[PDB]
């Protein structure tokens, strides 16, 4: 019993965190094999190719714990700077660089000065921002998922938007969303609720004994999305319906049956009642997260 | 900017997790130096659970009855002793990954990170608080017994909790790392129930100061209150009494935001009187009590927005 927001064990990632310094800018780097990946704005009309051509390998001070790492080359890939170093990290895990879609969740290891300070779980929002907990110096903190024994790096933190939300890239330097890495006016679009995730969390509530929101009713996929579109909810596709299959099978509540409960939960509200200790409908637990936390999968 | 429930990086703790097996019972152990700590109910059959004599059950066991597994390597047990509700298995090898550690016992309201393990294998990490009724609201299944709660201040890991059982209401109970239970619980299958739970008041006030630091001020009011008048209203909403120590502890946050502790208490009384009214504080529609005054100061800084 119990449903908590749970992150992946951060150990395999901690052994990769280093501190990258260029001039006055100091942020975090990800040391995998003989390369250190970090946001390219560490070298900061910012023409990054023009700013990088003027730098030498000794300008980058990379520090792994209390040991300095020797930079022997550097290249830029989109918005990420790759610093080729002298030593290959002995603690390099089995890893993969993956790009995630909105709605997908991941673990963030928040770092300051190459030293891990906290770990938390979050979701890639439909408007491509993340609602993280970041301060100055957290740039270069990474988002990951653990796949059996292989770490999947999916996010690298770059900046904070005027609304307190965060923006970053995948590990190939490609931004998530319509953002650019510079001091300019940038705004996160209107956010929507991740529908498939709220439904997964309602199945998790049923599994944990919370059944008050259930009803005898059902709906069509078209009638649900017409109401969802009105409440700023992401459209529920047939793929989403299919993905919720195992939870539907385990609880005996058909997906469109659970959609009628969400429909009533949107028009009539919580009414002083809570679902899993929450007075709001939670959207940062995917259907897979619910299965993993309510089955005991380990790494 | 941004306020999240944050756990400590679990790495230093992961390198300590092992699987302890005695007969058919299989749970987790904490391997520090040449000793493996685990709940003493690993020697119990699910039968003896009602009224077991652990001294009598341990005297009948030998070192080869305990199968300790660190990864894919078996650890050889060369001695064993019991300290309250924890079993200490002396082993042949000292853990090379042993961190700088300390066993600490915490008070209700205190927060810590939990590394949930199954079969000596870490599966997840989450942050929680020791409830006023001494239970924890964790996310645990069968086999999670022996999972540990910790705080990593500076480079030292402070072990403060070891999971033992789940109560009828879904809440969890356990001991400090010296085998002493938190609360009036016993490691027996007798009828036990968690008392009435109360809200950790000093933590809600800390979280309201964190909200002010993150820009949200809508809940603030022009009123102040006495400590006695606040507690009379707090009691009525099932809130823990706010002591003068709590008032003192909230001093730095009071200084940083410019809102006196008793002024924030009036804003809190008004929230309990009126509700949230469709508004949210730090992305929450409920008043959050699992962030201590020390967590807020740690996660936030010294510049208010
Ligand atoms: O409690 C024990 C063993 C035990 C028993 C008695 C005394 C001691 Cl000292 C130790 N281990 C568990 C720990 N944490 C969480 C659990 C969750 C569990 O199952 C969720 C669903 N429950 C199915 C039965 C009602 C609901 C089962 C077991 C859990
Ligand atoms: Cl404490």
Of B2, B284, B285, the CB nearest to A134: B2
Q: Which atom of ligand 1 lies at the shortest distance from residue B85's CA?
A: 9
DSSP state of B240: P
Q: CATH number of the domain at B15-99, please?
A: 2.40.10.10
Q: CATH number of the domain at A1-14+94-191, please?
A: 2.40.10.10
Sign of the dihedral defined by the CA atoms of residues B1, A83, A183, A284, in that order: negative
DSSP state of B173: E
* Probe site for chain A from B124, B154, B194, B288 (most A CB atoms < 10 A): B124
This PDB structure is determined at a resolution in Å of 2.2
Nearest CA owner, ligand 1 atom 27: B142
Of A4, A132, A274, the CB nearest to B126: A4
| Class of domain B1-14+100-197 as given by CATH | mainly beta
The answer to whether residues A285 and A292 touch, using CB atoms and an 8 Å cutoff, is no
Torsion of CA A194, A99, A141, A54, to 10 degrees: -140
At B152, list the tokens: 């990593």
- Tell me the CA distances in angstroms from B65 to B23, B48, B77, B142, B216, one per residue in order: 7, 18, 9, 22, 58
- For A92-105, letters b (16+ CB in 10 Å) and e give ebebeebbbebbbb
At B40, list the tokens: 């003493």
Query: Using CB atoms within 10 A of its CB, is residue B15 exposed (0-12), middle (13-18) or buried (19+)?
Result: middle
Q: Report the CATH fold assignment for B198-301.
A: main proteinase (3clpro) structure, domain 3 (1.10.1840)
At A209, list the tokens: 């004994």
At A90, list the tokens: 């002995």
DSSP state of A102: T
Looking from the CA of A93 toward its CB, the CA atoms found within 13 Å total 23
Question: What's the alpha-carbon Rg for chain B, to the nearest Å?
Answer: 22
Out of B41, B126, B145, B194, give the residue to mutate to test ligand 1, the one with the largest number of ligand atoms within 8 Å of its CB.
B145
- Alpha carbons A256 and A178: distance in angstroms, whole number: 34
Could you tell me which of B138, B260, B248, B264 has the C-alpha nearest to residue B207?
B264
DSSP state of B199: B
- Alpha carbons B162 and B153: distance in angstroms, whole number: 18
The answer to whether residues B17 and B121 touch, using CB atoms and an 8 Å cutoff, is yes
> How far is CA A296 from its chain centroid?
22
- Alpha carbons B128 and B134: distance in angstroms, whole number: 12
- Alpha carbons A128 and A159: distance in angstroms, whole number: 13
The answer to whether residues A79 and A181 touch, using CB atoms and an 8 Å cutoff, is yes
Ligand 2: centre distance to CA B85 (Å): 21
- Alpha carbons B21 and B73: distance in angstroms, whole number: 14
Nearest CA owner, ligand 1 atom 28: B142
The answer to whether residues B141 and A298 touch, using CB atoms and an 8 Å cutoff, is no
Decide if B11 and A164 are in contact by the 8 Å CB cutoff: no
- Tell me the CA distances in angstroms from B22 to A296, B43, B58, B65, B144, one per residue in order: 21, 6, 11, 6, 15
At B41, list the tokens: 């109910």
Full strand arrangement of the beta sheet holding B25-32 = B73-75, B66-70, B17-22, B25-32, B35-39, B86-91, B77-83
- Cite the residue boundaries of each domain of chain A with CATH code 2.40.10.10: 1-14+94-191, 15-93
CB contacts of B6 in chain A (<8 Å) are 110, 118-120, 133
Which residues have a Cβ under 8 Å from the Cβ of A90 and sit 6 or more positions away?
A: none
What is the H or E stretch that residue B256 is in? helix B251-257
DSSP state of A157: E
The answer to whether residues A43 and A81 touch, using CB atoms and an 8 Å cutoff, is yes
CB contacts of A109 in chain B (<8 Å) are 9
User: Residue A69 — φ and ψ, nearest 5°?
Assistant: -105, 135
Query: Using CB atoms within 10 A of its CB, is residue B196 exposed (0-12), middle (13-18) or buried (19+)?
Result: exposed
Classify B131 as helix, strand or coil: coil
Question: What's the alpha-carbon Rg for chain A, to the nearest Å?
Answer: 21
Which residues have a Cβ under 8 Å from the Cβ of A24 and sit 6 or more positions away?
A: none
Q: How many residues does chain B have?
A: 305
The answer to whether residues B252 and B303 touch, using CB atoms and an 8 Å cutoff, is no
Could you tell me which of B281, B272, B303 has the C-alpha nearest to residue B3?
B281
- Tell me the CA distances in angstroms from A81 to A44, A129, B253, one per residue in order: 12, 21, 39
At B265, list the tokens: 């208490």
At B98, list the tokens: 């042993």
DSSP letters of A39-84? EGGGG----HHHHHHT--GGGEEEEETTEEE-EEEEEEETTEEEEE
Classify A292 as helix, strand or coil: helix
Could you tell me which of B138, B102, B103 has the C-alpha nearest to residue B123?
B138
Query: Using CB atoms within 10 A of its CB, is residue B296 exposed (0-12), middle (13-18) or buried (19+)?
Result: buried
What is the H or E stretch that residue A135 is in? none
- Tell me the CA distances in angstroms from B282 to A103, A165, B131, B203, one per residue in order: 21, 12, 22, 14
Q: CATH number of the domain at A192-295, please?
A: 1.10.1840.10
> How far is CA B63 from its chain centroid?
32
The answer to whether residues A174 and A78 touch, using CB atoms and an 8 Å cutoff, is yes
Tokens 């010296």 correspond to: B178
Pairing between β-strand A94-97 and β-strand A150-160 as defined by DSSP bridges: parallel
Which residues have a Cβ under 8 Å from the Cβ of A128 and sit 6 or more positions away?
A: A102, A167, A175, A176, A177, A178, A179, A188
Concerning whether A41 is annotated as a catalytic residue, the answer is yes
| Closest ligand to the CA of B189 | 1
Helix, strand, coil proportions of chain B in percent (round to 5)? Answer: 25, 30, 45
Could you tell me which of B202, B170, B185 has the C-alpha nearest to residue B295?
B202
At B278, list the tokens: 């469709």
The answer to whether residues B225 and B266 touch, using CB atoms and an 8 Å cutoff, is yes
Tokens 């909790």 correspond to: B161
Torsion of CA B151, B157, B160, B162, to 10 degrees: 110
Could you tell me which of A191, A215, A189, A219 has the C-alpha nearest to residue A202?
A215
Classify A177 as helix, strand or coil: coil
Decide if B122 and A7 are in contact by the 8 Å CB cutoff: no
Decide if B126 and A5 are in contact by the 8 Å CB cutoff: yes
Could you tell me which of A249, A230, A232, A169 has the C-alpha nearest to residue A198?
A232
Query: Using CB atoms within 10 A of its CB, is residue B57 exposed (0-12), middle (13-18) or buried (19+)?
Result: middle
Spell out the alpha helix ranges (H) of chain A.
11-14, 48-53, 195-207, 221-230, 238-243, 245-251, 255-267, 287-293
User: Residue B195 — φ and ψ, nearest 5°?
Assistant: -65, 180
Method in brief? X-ray
- In three-state form (DSSP H/G/I as H, E/B as E, the rest C), the secondary structure along B35-98 is EEEEEHHHCCCCCHHHCCCHHHHHHCCCHHHEEEEECCEEECEEEEEEECCEEEEEECCCCCCC
Decide if B2 and A280 are in contact by the 8 Å CB cutoff: no
CB contacts of A160 in chain B (<8 Å) are 1-2
Out of B165, B179, B182, B189, give the residue to mutate to test ligand 1, the one with the largest number of ligand atoms within 8 Å of its CB.
B165
Ligand 1: centre distance to CA A299 (Å): 22
Q: CATH number of the domain at A15-93, please?
A: 2.40.10.10
CB contacts of A120 in chain B (<8 Å) are 4-7
Tokens 């429909």 correspond to: A263
Ligand 1: centre distance to CA B178 (Å): 22
The answer to whether residues A17 and A37 touch, using CB atoms and an 8 Å cutoff, is no
- Alpha carbons B153 and B131: distance in angstroms, whole number: 21
Which residues have a Cβ under 8 Å from the Cβ of A103 and sit 6 or more positions away?
A: A123, A124, A126, A194, A196, A197, A234, A286
Decide if A7 and B124 are in contact by the 8 Å CB cutoff: yes
Q: How many residues does chain A have?
A: 299
Query: Using CB atoms within 10 A of its CB, is residue A63 exposed (0-12), middle (13-18) or buried (19+)?
Result: middle
């Amino acid at each position: 019993s119990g449903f908590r927001k749970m992150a992946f064990p951060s150990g395999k990632v901690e052994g990769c965190m280093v501190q990258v310094t260029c001039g006055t800018t100091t942020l975090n780097g990800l040391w995998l094999d003989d390369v250190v990946y970090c946001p390219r704005h560490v070298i900061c009309n910012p023409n990054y190719e023009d700013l990088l051509i003027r730098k030498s390998n000794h300008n980058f001070l990379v520090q792994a714990g209390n040991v300095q790492l020797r930079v022997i080359g550097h290249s830029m890939q989109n918005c990420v700077l790759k610093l080729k170093v002298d030593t290959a990290n002995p603690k390099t895990p089995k890893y993969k660089f993956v790009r995630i879609q909105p709605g997908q969740t991941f673990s963030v290891l928040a770092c300051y000065n190459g030293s891990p300070s906290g770990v938390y779980q979050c979701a890639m929002r439909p408007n491509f921002t993340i609602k993280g907990s970041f301060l100055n110096g957290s740039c270069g903190s990474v988002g990951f998922n653990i796949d059996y024994d292989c770490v999947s790096f999916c996010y690298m933190h770059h900046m904070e938007l005027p609304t307190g939300v965060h923006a970053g890239t995948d590990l190939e330097g490609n931004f998530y969303g319509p953002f650019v890495d510079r001091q300019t006016a940038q705004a996160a679009g209107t956010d929507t609720t991740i529908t498939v995730n709220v439904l997964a969390w309602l199945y998790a509530a049923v599994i944990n004994g919370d059944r008050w929101f259930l009803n005898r009713f059902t709906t069509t996929l078209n009638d649900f999305n017409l109401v969802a579109m009105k409440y700023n909810y992401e459209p529920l596709t047939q793929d989403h319906v299919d993905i919720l299959g195992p939870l539907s099978a385990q609880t005996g509540i058909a997906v469109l049956d659970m959609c009628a409960s969400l429909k009533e939960l949107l028009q009539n509200g919580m009414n002083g009642r809570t679902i899993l200790g929450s007075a709001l409908l939670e959207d940062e637990f995917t259907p897979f997260d619910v299965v993993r936390q309510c089955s005991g999968v380990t790494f």
